[PDB]
Design a protein around this ligand. Structure first.
Ligand SMILES: [Cl-]
Lengths: 9, 9
């Protein structure tokens, strides 16, 4: 998982 | 799953 996605989630 | 998320995926 990307950091970007982790921040969105 | 949201429709938006389905569409991004
Ligand atoms: Cl997004």
């Amino acid at each position: 998982e990307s950091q970007l996605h982790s921040n969105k989630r």
